[PDB]
Design a protein around this nucleic acid. Sequence first.
DNA 1: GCTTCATCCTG
DNA 2: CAGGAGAAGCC
Length: 252
Amino acid sequence: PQGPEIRRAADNLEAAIKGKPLTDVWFAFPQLKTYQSQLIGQHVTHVETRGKALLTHFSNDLTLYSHNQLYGVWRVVDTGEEPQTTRVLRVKLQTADKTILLYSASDIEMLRPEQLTTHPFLQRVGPDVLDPNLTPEVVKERLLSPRFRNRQFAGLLLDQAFLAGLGNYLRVEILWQVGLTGNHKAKDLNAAQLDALAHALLEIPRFSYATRGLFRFKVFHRDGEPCERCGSIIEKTTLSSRPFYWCPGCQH
DNA sequence: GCTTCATCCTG
DNA sequence: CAGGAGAAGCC
Ligand SMILES: [Zn+2]
């Protein structure tokens, strides 16, 4: 899962317990046990995202950080209820009625103010595609800036240092959107393809966020399926040490 | 890249 | 049941 799916969950989280006094806190990691009693009686002032990184802030200026990587997922149940699964619960934040549960995730750390600009991941990430103030123009400048100008999209479109919230499926989809493969570079592009790439880089991820579960897959998990644009045979290969879906007669 | 820690589902 | 599907670590 990526930014789109991470913001949708964050919101579900805010919709369930934000502003609500926590009647209980629980963590799997012993190291975090110390913040439990500490958090009881406090409340989430706001849950923030910055890519696939999840920051759940508290009234006492503490912030719960977490990355779902590829297995962590958030649940939202009614207090006292715990649907079953083999997943390993990692965090419990409960209030009178609503409760949220985090399973699987392994990157769960508690930050005080300072680490919010010091954490290993937080320090690294670039603008958020879901971030409003982030405009195509800015994103367009960044593509041409000297820090990314000479980098292939196959790898760049995955690098959080460039843009937070983009993952693989968004990787294949965005490039298919503008008819490109992962072997190009911002510098090897005309003004019409950069501006295109630019928007797709923000619009698509958003469209996914706003509509995924309208948004549908156009090349992800579609090997053997017919390209909807030209109709060529979409092949599955490996790009960036991960699966890459694309159209042979649609991407150059 | 490449190699590795780290969960969970098909397959 | 081995593979396989977001990042940091080391050349
Ligand atoms: Zn095509």
